[PDB]
């Protein structure tokens, strides 16, 4: 019994984390087979970041301009190319600990685990959600660029690589194909994080987790229509619950016996009259950073 912010085990990814230095600039890289993937701003300098031309900068770089270290062991760069905001460094040795992997782009609202790394050494692992405005509320210090996010399906799904911190203390990054989540750019310019909303399907999944764990005070007798629920939800800056969200809650409704619209009604109550100083699962706010899948894993 119990419920906790639970990350995937990190061991498969720890063995892929290397250090990548380009002159003065250092960050982490992902070492898969005989390629190392890292944020392409490693080839810049602080002066460049204002308006940088990455195309030329890469031309003037040569393989020797890149120092890759995996542990004490140096890796030799024998080629370099650029895919969107991600740099791909070809190396002589294939990573012996390469796991079965695949590059996925995640939808906003889905969660992943983040392995925070410094100078290619892992420091910790935590869970994160892709907010609806395509930012994540991570925990990153100077030198963590190139940390990655993943899910495990024994196949690792890499889905996030860290690039910058927005002014609100919130982070932005790319997928392993180099494309930024959201509208952000690896150049020094004014970049706003949009107005955020709450991930409805996740708050629901969380309430199911509460019921499974014996916390059911908030269950009511009423029901609602999906459309009438969305009318109340949007008023509270909640994401509109979709038919595809409804199917995904399926396992949780089956396990508890509580249908989805039953729970939507219980949530409507909480949204209107608040909690009245009570805790659902020891938390006094509503939690929206657990996907339905996440609940199924911990309550299987």
């Amino acid at each position: 019994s119990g419920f906790r912010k639970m990350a995937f085990p990190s061991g498969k990814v720890e063995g892929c984390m290397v250090q990548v230095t380009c002159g003065t600039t250092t960050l982490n890289g992902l070492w898969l087979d005989d390629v190392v993937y890292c944020p392409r701003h490693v080839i810049c300098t602080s002066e460049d970041m204002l308006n940088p031309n990455y195309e030329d900068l890469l031309i003037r770089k040569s393989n020797h301009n890149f120092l890759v270290q995996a542990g004490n062991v140096q890796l030799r760069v024998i080629g370099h190319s650029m895919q969107n905001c991600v740099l791909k460094l070809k190396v002589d040795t294939a990573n012996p600990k390469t796991p079965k992997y695949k590059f996925v782009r995640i939808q906003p609202g889905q969660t992943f685990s983040v392995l925070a790394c410094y100078n290619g050494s892992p420091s910790g692992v935590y869970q994160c959600a892709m907010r609806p405005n395509f930012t994540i509320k991570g925990s990153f210090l100077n030198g963590s660029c190139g940390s990655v996010g993943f899910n495990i399906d024994d196949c690792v799904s890499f889905c996030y690589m860290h690039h910058m911190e927005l002014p609100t203390g919130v982070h932005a990054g790319t997928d392993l194909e180099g494309n930024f989540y959201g509208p952000f750019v690896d150049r020094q310019t004014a970049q706003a994080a949009g107005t955020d909303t709450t991930i409805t399907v996740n708050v629901l999944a969380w309430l199911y987790a509460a019921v499974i764990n014996g916390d059911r005070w908030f269950l009511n007798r009423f029901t609602t229509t999906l459309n009438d629920f969305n009318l109340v939800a949007m008023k509270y800056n909640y994401e509109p619950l979709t038919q595809d969200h409804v199917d995904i809650l399926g396992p949780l409704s089956a396990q508890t016996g509580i249908a989805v619209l039953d729970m939507c009604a219980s949530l409507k109550e909480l949204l209107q009259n608040g909690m009245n100083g009570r805790t659902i699962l020891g938390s006094a706010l509503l939690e929206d950073e657990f996907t339905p899948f996440d609940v199924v894993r911990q309550c299987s």
């Binding site: 003065t24 600039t25 250092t26 960050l27 944020p39 701003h41 490693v42 810049c44 602080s46 970041m49 204002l50 990153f140 210090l141 100077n142 030198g143 963590s144 660029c145 860290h162 690039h163 910058m164 911190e165 927005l166 002014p167 932005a172 690896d186 020094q188 310019t189 004014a190 970049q191």
Partner: peptide, 15 residues
């Protein structure tokens, strides 16, 4: 501005 979490960080032009 934004901050890039190199190193070594690209900061705040800002100043």
């Amino acid at each position: 501005x934004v901050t890039f979490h190199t190193x070594x960080p690209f900061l705040x032009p800002x100043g």
